[PDB]
Amino acid sequence: SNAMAVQLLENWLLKEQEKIQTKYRHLNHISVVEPNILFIGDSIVEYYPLQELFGTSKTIVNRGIRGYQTGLLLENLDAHLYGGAVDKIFLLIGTNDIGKDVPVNEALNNLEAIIQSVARDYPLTEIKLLSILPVNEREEYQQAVYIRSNEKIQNWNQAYQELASAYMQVEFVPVFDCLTDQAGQLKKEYTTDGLHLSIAGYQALSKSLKDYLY
Amino acid sequence: AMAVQLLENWLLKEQEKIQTKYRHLNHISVVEPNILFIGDSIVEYYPLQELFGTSKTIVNRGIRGYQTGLLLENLDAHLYGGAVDKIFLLIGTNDIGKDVPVNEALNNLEAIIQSVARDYPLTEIKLLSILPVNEREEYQQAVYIRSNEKIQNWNQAYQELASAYMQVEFVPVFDCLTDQAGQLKKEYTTDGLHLSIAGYQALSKSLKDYLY
Amino acid sequence: AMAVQLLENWLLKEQEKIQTKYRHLNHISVVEPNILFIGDSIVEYYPLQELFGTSKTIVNRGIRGYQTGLLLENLDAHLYGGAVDKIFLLIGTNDIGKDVPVNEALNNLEAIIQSVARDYPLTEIKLLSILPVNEREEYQQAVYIRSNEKIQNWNQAYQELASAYMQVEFVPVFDCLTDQAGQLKKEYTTDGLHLSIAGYQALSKSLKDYLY
Amino acid sequence: MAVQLLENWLLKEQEKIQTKYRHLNHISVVEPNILFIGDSIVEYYPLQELFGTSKTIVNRGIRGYQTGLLLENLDAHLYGGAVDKIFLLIGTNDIGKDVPVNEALNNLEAIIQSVARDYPLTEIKLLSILPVNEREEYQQAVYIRSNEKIQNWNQAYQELASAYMQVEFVPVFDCLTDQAGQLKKEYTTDGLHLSIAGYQALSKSLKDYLY
Ligand SMILES: [Mg+2]
Numbered sequence: 001s002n003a004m005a006v007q008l009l010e011n012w013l014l015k016e017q018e019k020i021q022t023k024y025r026h027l028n029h030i031s032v033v034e035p036n037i038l039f040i041g042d043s044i045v046e047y048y049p050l051q052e053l054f055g056t057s058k059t060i061v062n063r064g065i066r067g068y069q070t071g072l073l074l075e076n077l078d079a080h081l082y083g084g085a086v087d088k089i090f091l092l093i094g095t096n097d098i099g100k101d102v103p104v105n106e107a108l109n110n111l112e113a114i115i116q117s118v119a120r121d122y123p124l125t126e127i128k129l130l131s132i133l134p135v136n137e138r139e140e141y142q143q144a145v146y147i148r149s150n151e152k153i154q155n156w157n158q159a160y161q162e163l164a165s166a167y168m169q170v171e172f173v174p175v176f177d178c179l180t181d182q183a184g185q186l187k188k189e190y191t192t193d194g195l196h197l198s199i200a201g202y203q204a205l206s207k208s209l210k211d212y213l214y
Numbered sequence: 215a216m217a218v219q220l221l222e223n224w225l226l227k228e229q230e231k232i233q234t235k236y237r238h239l240n241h242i243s244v245v246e247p248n249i250l251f252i253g254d255s256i257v258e259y260y261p262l263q264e265l266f267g268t269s270k271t272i273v274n275r276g277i278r279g280y281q282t283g284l285l286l287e288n289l290d291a292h293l294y295g296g297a298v299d300k301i302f303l304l305i306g307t308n309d310i311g312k313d314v315p316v317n318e319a320l321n322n323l324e325a326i327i328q329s330v331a332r333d334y335p336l337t338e339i340k341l342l343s344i345l346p347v348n349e350r351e352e353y354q355q356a357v358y359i360r361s362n363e364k365i366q367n368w369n370q371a372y373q374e375l376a377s378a379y380m381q382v383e384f385v386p387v388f389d390c391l392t393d394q395a396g397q398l399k400k401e402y403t404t405d406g407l408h409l410s411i412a413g414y415q416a417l418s419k420s421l422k423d424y425l426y
Numbered sequence: 427a428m429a430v431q432l433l434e435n436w437l438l439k440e441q442e443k444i445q446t447k448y449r450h451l452n453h454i455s456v457v458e459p460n461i462l463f464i465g466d467s468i469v470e471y472y473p474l475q476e477l478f479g480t481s482k483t484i485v486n487r488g489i490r491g492y493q494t495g496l497l498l499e500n501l502d503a504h505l506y507g508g509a510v511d512k513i514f515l516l517i518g519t520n521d522i523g524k525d526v527p528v529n530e531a532l533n534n535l536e537a538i539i540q541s542v543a544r545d546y547p548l549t550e551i552k553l554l555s556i557l558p559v560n561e562r563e564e565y566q567q568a569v570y571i572r573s574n575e576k577i578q579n580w581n582q583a584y585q586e587l588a589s590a591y592m593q594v595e596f597v598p599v600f601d602c603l604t605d606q607a608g609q610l611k612k613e614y615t616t617d618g619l620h621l622s623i624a625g626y627q628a629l630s631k632s633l634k635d636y637l638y
Numbered sequence: 639m640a641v642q643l644l645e646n647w648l649l650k651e652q653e654k655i656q657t658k659y660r661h662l663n664h665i666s667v668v669e670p671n672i673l674f675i676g677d678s679i680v681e682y683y684p685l686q687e688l689f690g691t692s693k694t695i696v697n698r699g700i701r702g703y704q705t706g707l708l709l710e711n712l713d714a715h716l717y718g719g720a721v722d723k724i725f726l727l728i729g730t731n732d733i734g735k736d737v738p739v740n741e742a743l744n745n746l747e748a749i750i751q752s753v754a755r756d757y758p759l760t761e762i763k764l765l766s767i768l769p770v771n772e773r774e775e776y777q778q779a780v781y782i783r784s785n786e787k788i789q790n791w792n793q794a795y796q797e798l799a800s801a802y803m804q805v806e807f808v809p810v811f812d813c814l815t816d817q818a819g820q821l822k823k824e825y826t827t828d829g830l831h832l833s834i835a836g837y838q839a840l841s842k843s844l845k846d847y848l849y
Pocket residue numbers: 164165166167168169170171172
């Protein structure tokens with residue numbers, strides 16, 4: 001690598017995120033569907049084949065953005081919310097806070113502020129706060145997994161669970177264990193690069209989430 | 215006796231026609247019901263779109279004159295959709311009006327609940343309290359043998375049934391609709407039994423939070 | 427004669443009740459109609475939501491047994507909204523059924539069109555052809571004195587009236603509902619006059635280019 | 639060479655999407671009524687939020703795609719037992735890479751023939767390639783594409799469509815141009831890709847072909 005190229009790639013990620021935020025802000029106004037469920041979060045959400053794995057009878061709208069962290073979501077929360085009859089918001093975020101060494105208390109405070117902001121504007125809407133998903137710690141996946149570890153992820157998940165217990169409208173959704181193998185790693189078949197999910201991974205995640213859609 | 219029997223025949227014919235309509239519509243409908251409203255004439259004549267709006271797709275499967283037995287026997291006509299979040303059920307005032315024994319009506323309702331629990335396992339049933347009537351003499355032609363004392367007793371039984379089933383929530387709306395004398399408000403009714411638009415506005419306001 | 431008068435009285439009472447319902451709903455509806463459907467029982471009973479969907483807000487202002495004169499007299503009950511794009515009007519089969527003189531019905535329709543042109547100047551009116559009936563003897567109870575010959579003559583008059591008014595388009599749907607004998611298809615009808623769900627599917631398909 | 643490795647980036651991202659689609663084709667829980675196939679403009683198209691879900695429309699677009707890549711990997715883009723229509727938007731990257739028009743048309747003809755045998759009751763809607771905006775400010779995305787080229791390719795697409803009863807040419811180019819014949823500024827992000835206003839205008843133009 002090359003530090004000039006480092007900056008410009010960081011710049012590439014920022015401009016892609018800004019482009020997607022702009023896209024969502026305009027769709028929020030002109031969309032022809034009413035979201036029953038909004039899926040909000042990071043790359044795992046953006047790339048989730050929601051239609052093809054959950055079907056179309058329940059309208060689930062994607063408001064995920066690659067590389068997102070809790071602070072970015074809080075700052076731009078308006079891009080991720082619309083509709084007159086939102087039953088539930090599914091929130092999957094934090095793996096990138098871990099990958100950037102964001103203090104857990106800062107991430108939590110960010111999540112708490114998101115919950116409170118949603119309560120004001122969407123008072124009858126439930127939030128399903130997903131466990132951060134496991135990673136695969138095999139050497140071959142070190143490039144995507146980076147400083148994430150399943151011990152850190154499990155510690156954050158304990159904190160998310162405690163945060164959920166403080167709000168009647170928030171339910172913690174334990175999906176971590178559904179995606180692990182017997183060594184407590186994200187299953188090889190469920191991953192492309194140790195962090196992101198394969199289609200088998202998304203299928204397994206969807207099976208674990210289905211009941212929470214109702 | 216003879217003309218009254220022919221009127222009962224009329225009603226049955228109309229109900230059968232509506233059941234056919236519904237079976238056919240369920241098959242080719244261009245919408246996915248988020249919520250199904252099922253019940254008797256108070257449901258059939260409910261102006262759902264104009265009082266709740268269309269953010270949620272709320273589909274009407276009500277039938278005038280319906281009773282719990284008729285609904286059970288024809289339950290297939292009243293259910294469709296791939297992701298029904300909620301079924302709102304308002305029925306029983308015609309069971310009372312026809313002197314159907316409460317235990318029969320409650321067994322019919324339990325069977326409905328168990329059927330939906332099996333076939334629509336993640337769907338919630340919102341079991342409404344039967345609505346109050348107005349017992350004043352001027353409304354006797356519609357109200358007939360119904361009384362608010364009977365209705366409240368049946369509502370207690372509905373509440374108890376709902377308590378036995380995870381997917382069922384009893385929705386107490388009776389009290390929203392009464393005047394200080396415990397009668398369906400005169401302004402809320404057309405004939406002492408059916409609702410005026412003001413009655414439907416009051417009912418809608420009471421149901422709004424149960425939609426989520 | 428006593429009972430025939432009572433049946434007339436029954437219908438009159440129900441129509442008045444629906445007019446009151448609509449006047450009240452017009453006042454407090456939570457939706458802005460993009461399209462109003464106005465007319466007789468074929469409109470009242472039209473499953474608009476489940477056949478057209480809800481991408482546009484389509485509001486039902488039909489009344490069973492309606493005739494052009496009753497609609498004109500009560501036109502206020504059928505119209506509301508701050509930006510109505512289209513009004514679909516299906517009416518006249520009960521004028522024919524009651525032997526209303528054609529010139530009277532056409533004068534009534536012209537008055538309705540002129541009223542809407544004044545009060546809803548940016549709204550398009552879609553004036554549907556009266557639908558065919560089935561003339562087979564099994565359907566004589568509903569069909570009565572209606573005939574496809576009379577209906578087609580009235581439709582020619584409707585087309586002429588529409589041609590005179592800028593914001594009125596005649597919508598020829600009659601031929602979309604007939605079999606090879608020129609009758610309303612048996613599968614399209616419940617009683618020879620009213621539509622089955624298949625008949626409403628065919629009518630909805632033929633209206634789609636005028637709606638969207 | 640950084641450009642060699644950017645070419646390599648794109649190829650690897652395309653292969654990853656092909657893998658994803660091939661697996662989805664097997665385990666999808668929906669029966670697509672309409673498949674949208676093509677390049678970046680398709681991948682990034684907000685189909686659900688702009689067309690709604692009265693019909694099940696499935697996205698099988700891939701960024702940077704060209705007619706040859708599509709033909710070689712056509713299996714990744716097709717599935718379902720009841721597909722009413724396929725919408726195909728592709729060619730702007732063939733123009734951008736200076737692929738001979740004859741080569742691109744033979745690839746498209748090969749694609750149409752393959753779909754014909756496997757999906758005989760399915761209509762193919764072959765879209766006109768969309769206009770670009772030729773202003774200098776957009777040159778990083780637009781590159782060697784010109785509206786003159788695009789219109790010439792669209793004439794050829796129209797002729798190819800005329801040779802198959804199952805294929806209808808869908809002329810949307812003119813719906814997206816300004817008075818100078820450029821892609822309208824408010825319809826574009828970078829002179830080539832569409833803004834949401836652009837996708838809404840495209841959707842409005844396509845509605846009569848979808849429903
Ligand atoms: Mg909680």
